Amino acid sequence: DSRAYGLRITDMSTLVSAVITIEAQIWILIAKAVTAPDTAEESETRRW
């Protein structure tokens, strides 16, 4: 979402929720990062 980039954050509640989504989406990749990175994006989408 283009609005998610230039978004002003001042509430701690919004920052925490925003951070986890960035954290969670990164942590999905570790499951299939070295085994079969090319064949990913199927289980990763399922996890998301």
Added chain:
RNA sequence: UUUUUUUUUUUUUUUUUUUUUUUUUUUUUUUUUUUUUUUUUUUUUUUUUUUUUUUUUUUUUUUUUUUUUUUUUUUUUUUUUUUU
């Protein structure tokens, strides 16, 4: 919840028998008579050293493979209604 019954009535002394009578000493036999020394045999005569063989002759490095590829949240139900 509960509804019955739940005293007693007979009999219950005794009657026989219960001393004793036989037998119960003894009579045989019961010493002994044989046999019972000895007569053979009983030294020895073979054999008994030795004669083979007995070193050795092969082989004995190595040649493959040896990462991974899926899945992995959840979706129902869950008071009671008698009798006593």
